Amino acid sequence: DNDSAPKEPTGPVTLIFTDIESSTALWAAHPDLMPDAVATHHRLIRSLITRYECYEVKTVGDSFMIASKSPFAAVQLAQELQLCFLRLDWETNAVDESYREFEEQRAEGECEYTPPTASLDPEVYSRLWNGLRVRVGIHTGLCDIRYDEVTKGYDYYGRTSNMAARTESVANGGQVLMTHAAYMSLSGEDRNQLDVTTLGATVLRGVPEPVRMYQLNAVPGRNFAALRLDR
């Protein structure tokens, strides 16, 4: 179960961090829907991990940490993740109703913030949003690779892992962010097969210099709030 894990300290690793947007609030509002929805979320993501020969490093709550020996496979996985979650019949509209409510609640209490999906017409909304919203951050770089003798698993520490994590932290639900390093790790040909939007320099907590962010338009037409920067 470790053949897909990047094992060479000299080989750059592409890390993908994911998290379910507003899962805490969803758990509170839908204790009856979340166990199943999250279980589905895990199954979908694990199928993608296998399909793109990536490696599941760990799961923390509903967050996934995935490693890939290939920058492109990581990007494909992230794109397919958004599409798969959008296309799946979640058997409930309650999650979407809650997401729209959260935007509305946030809008009234924050000046300079507008709901990115709650203002869409019903039919338009369902063509772009459906079910759990997963934020995804992707970064590529050399990592300090650690092997666990007891689990036979591999973990990745260092600034590279922290960079991937903070990139995910600023992404909104349904958004896929790639750092300049990840984006440029892809070959020129690979980049041209993708629909990407430059977001520009972004300030990440604990990172000295601004990081140029690239939005992978996995579900063309989606709008997002400003990045979840600290203050």
Token look-up 């260092």 returns 158
Interface residue with a second copy among 61, 200, 210, 221 (CB under 8 A) is: 61
Q: Is 63 in the site for Mg ion (CB under 5 A)?
A: yes
Beta carbon nearer to a second copy, 27 or 100? 27
Using alpha carbons, select from 98, 79, 91 the residue that is nearest to residue 222: 79
Site pattern 169..208 for a second copy (x: CB under 8 A) = x-----------------------x------------x--
Rounded Cα gap, residues 31 and 36, in angstroms: 10
Q: Is 44 in the site for a second copy (CB under 8 A)?
A: yes
Q: Is 73 in the site for a second copy (CB under 8 A)?
A: no
Q: Is 19 in the site for Mg ion (CB under 5 A)?
A: yes
Q: Is 36 in the site for a second copy (CB under 8 A)?
A: yes
110-115: list long-range contacts, CB under 8 Å, 24+ apart: 113/225, 113/226, 114/225
Token look-up 């967050």 returns 63
Beta carbon nearer to Mg ion, 51 or 87? 87
Q: In what order do the strands lie in the sheet with 63-68?
A: 55-60, 63-68, 13-20, 134-141, 176-179, 211-216, 196-202
Minimum CB separation of residue 13 from Mg ion in Å reads 22
Rounded Cα gap, residues 69 and 64, in angstroms: 17
Q: Is 108 in the site for a second copy (CB under 8 A)?
A: no
Among a second copy, Mg ion, none, what does residue 152 contact (CB within 5–8 Å per kind)? none
Is residue 121 a known part of a binding site? no
Angle at CA of residue 151, ends 163 and 182, nearest 5°: 20
Q: Is 61 in the site for Mg ion (CB under 5 A)?
A: yes
Beta carbon nearer to a second copy, 40 or 223? 40
Q: Is 11 in the site for a second copy (CB under 8 A)?
A: no
Interface residue with Mg ion among 62, 96, 103, 168 (CB under 5 A) is: 62
133 and 175 in contact (C-beta within 8 Å)? Answer: no
Beta carbon nearer to a second copy, 3 or 220? 220
Q: Which residues bind Mg ion (CB under 5 A)?
A: 19, 23, 61-63
Q: Which residues bind a second copy (CB under 8 A)?
A: 19, 24-25, 27-28, 35-36, 39-40, 43-44, 58, 60-61, 63, 76, 84, 87-89, 91, 123, 126, 149-150, 169, 193, 206
Going by the annotation, the residues of the binding site for Mg(2+) are 19, 62
